[PDB]
Design a protein around this ligand. Sequence first.
Ligand SMILES: CS(=O)(=O)CCNCc1ccc(-c2ccc3ncnc(Nc4ccc(OCc5cccc(F)c5)c(Cl)c4)c3c2)o1
Length: 289
Amino acid sequence: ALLRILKETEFKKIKVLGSGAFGTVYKGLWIPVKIPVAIKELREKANKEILDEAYVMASVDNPHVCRLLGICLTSTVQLITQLMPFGCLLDYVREHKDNIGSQYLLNWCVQIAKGMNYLEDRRLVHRDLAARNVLVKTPQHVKITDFGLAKLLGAEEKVPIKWMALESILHRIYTHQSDVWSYGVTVWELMTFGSKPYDGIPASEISSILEKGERLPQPPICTIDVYMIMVKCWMIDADSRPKFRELIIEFSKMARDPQRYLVIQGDERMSNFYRALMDEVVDADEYLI
Ligand SMILES: CS(=O)(=O)CCNCc1ccc(-c2ccc3ncnc(Nc4ccc(OCc5cccc(F)c5)c(Cl)c4)c3c2)o1
């Protein structure tokens, strides 16, 4: 079964990871061997529609995209997926604000770009792409998660405002090109090692400054070449923004000569922590082999 219907006794929530905008995520074990998993319990028979979108979250198959392993429909709804041992990309760059070289930064951009392009091939608009919604399987590989939920929970029926495209803020219009805007902010978050976008500025005034032409500032380590891509992602005209397929090629090219596009001191010179962090056993990987 592509979307496993887990019985309440099959898994157990052990600790709290964090509270999101759609629900609370827990880390735990899945006993079909014990499999370390992340369990998302949504905030609030209608499960028919839920199972439908849930299916999409489970049918994705790409190395840069998280896959839903199962669902549990009791009073509330619980989504179960493989636990990403390094947590989310946002906290990761924050913690390693130093020891992170241009090679990693660019490789992540490529990876996230591949994941988004893949979702575009499945005609799936993410709607909530951000550094906090990118997981770290290993420092070498990251994966996009949390897609599908926005739509499911009524994102386009009568608020990540700082990651949203102008058209999304004003008209609830979400397309693959609105995802490209969010992609731009996500990249900005990486390059600034986790800065908060438009920090300080009130959400209600964002559409206003965007219309004025204001955009997130050029990250210190970025050559104007990398920043132009970010700016191009934030164009009012959605069709003028880069395509994920083009972003893949551009960031991949930049990844061949990282020190030419990103200027970080000591770039060249650039485990137990996450064990004591996440450890409460076979990877969902081995088990699902
Ligand atoms: C970064 S911050 O300062 O803003 C706050 C920190 N964020 C809280 C946090 C820390 C760590 C995690 C975390 C760590 C490991 C994880 N491993 C797997 N999944 C995680 N989250 C998650 C996201 C979505 C989920 O269901 C929806 C979905 C949609 C598409 C595909 C899918 F596979 C799943 C589930 Cl079940 C878990 C996770 C979070 O969340």
